[PDB]
Amino acid sequence: EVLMTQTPLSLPVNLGDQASISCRSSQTIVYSNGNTYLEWYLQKPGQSPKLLIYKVSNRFSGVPDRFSGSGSGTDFTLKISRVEADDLGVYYCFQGSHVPFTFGSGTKLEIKRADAAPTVSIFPPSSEQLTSGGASVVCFLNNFYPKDINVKWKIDGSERQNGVLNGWTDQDSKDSTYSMSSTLTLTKDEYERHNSYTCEATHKTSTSPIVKSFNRN
Amino acid sequence: AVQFLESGAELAKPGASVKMSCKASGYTFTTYWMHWVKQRPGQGLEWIGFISPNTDYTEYNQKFRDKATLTADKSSTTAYMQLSSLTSEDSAVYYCARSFIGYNFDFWGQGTTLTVSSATTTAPSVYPLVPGCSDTSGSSVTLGCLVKGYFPEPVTVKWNYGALSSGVRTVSSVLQSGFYSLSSLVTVPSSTWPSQTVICNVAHPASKTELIKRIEPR
């Protein structure tokens, strides 16, 4: 099978800068008709891939002029000039010359931007959750950069490790920030045995933690 | 326009077979090949095979030789893929896409999420995420829906039927004892809520449900 090797695996880029994505085929992929069926696709988070470039260097309809593809033989390049916030996602090359058709190993374009501190919200469980026998306390950290963040939970001043799970958004299409939920799930019985619940978020944007807290009055 | 409606989410038992469909519109169905592509969670794309509807000619990636069977139906302009002897390794998103001339996958369906598991379908519970009674917000307030206890993937969330999309953050699901949960949050100006309606629309295709929930203060 034709191996389609892409580098880099991940590509951090400032807005307005140029990104170059390389694709190396394990053999030539000129088809018996003289055409090279080499395509580039972009897949944005939770979406189907979308075609960008075909036959090496041809822009698909609607693709902006700042996407260009070039190469020959076993060496192909996608360039994106003047990168914009919505260019993020995974780029794949693809060869449709030799069966089986194969795609590249994929390059995640990521946006670099200035640091941004999280806005933290804490959400007590809804009384609507109580007959499930569970109670989720959610700490939400909105619009921060970079992605790495620490979240600490406290219950009546004592720190807690069990029952905590964390989920992230993809990088925002518009401001290029991340958000994340930290969810402490307890039994309804544990929840009701305690009074204050605190989440503290620590991020490189400040030496001070952002502490959000409530009491079931 | 060229569109593909794909079945969405399917749950199947280890060792079973499952069929999925891709209804094509927006072009002469017998003029173009229909291809299928596999994508495992966090992984790349793998081409499976194609069928020409006009002659029923099929070509396969030999890796899927006894795994996939591609069929098609002219009159209903629908392409089909059957997957047999299912294992957890078959859990993936399956895209159909047509191929054009000079170029391939100009248009792709949205993908069917297939989960292979012995566990049964569970629609999500949905809970409001709203500030504590004494919370003092500045110029914005963040509200949400906690979607809990569902199986299999995916769930999607829209806000006001899709009309609130600015400041929506839907985080990735987490799995716990066989069930998934996620939160979807929106940030609005503090002057707009509770005075204006904020609604989350929680879709869970494996159970064929949309849950519409009006979000209100505690």
Residue numbers in the entry:
A (entry chain L): 1 to 217
B (entry chain H): 1 to 218
The study reports:
An established carbohydrate-based cancer marker is the Thomsen-Friedenreich (TF) antigen (Galβ1-3GalNAcα), which is typically found O-linked to serine or threonine residues. Here, we examine the specificity of a potentially diagnostic and therapeutic monoclonal antibody (mAb JAA-F11) that was raised against the TF antigen. JAA-F11 preferentially binds to tumor tissue over normal, and in vivo it enhances survival and decreases metastasis in the mouse 4T1 metastatic model, indicating a potential for this mAb to be used, after humanization, in cancer patient therapy.
The overall JAA-F11 Fab fold in ribbons (heavy chain residues in blue, light chain in green) indicating the CDRs (heavy chain in light blue, light chain in yellow). b. Computational docking of the TF disaccharide was performed with AutoDock 3.05 to identify possible poses of the antigen in the Fab JAA-F11 binding site. Pose 1 from the docking was both top ranked in terms of cluster population, and lowest energy, and explained the specificity of this mAb for α-linked TF antigen. Protein residues (yellow carbon frame) involved in hydrogen bonds (black lines) or hydrophobic interactions with the TF antigen are shown. b. Depiction of the stacking interaction between the Gal and the TrpH33 (r  =  4.0 Å, θ  =  12.1°, φ  =  90.3°); the geometry of this interaction is comparable to literature values (lower left). c. In all cases, methyl glycosides were employed and confirmed the exclusive tolerance for the α-configuration at the reducing terminus of the TF antigen; all β-anomers led to steric overlaps between the methyl and the mAb surface.
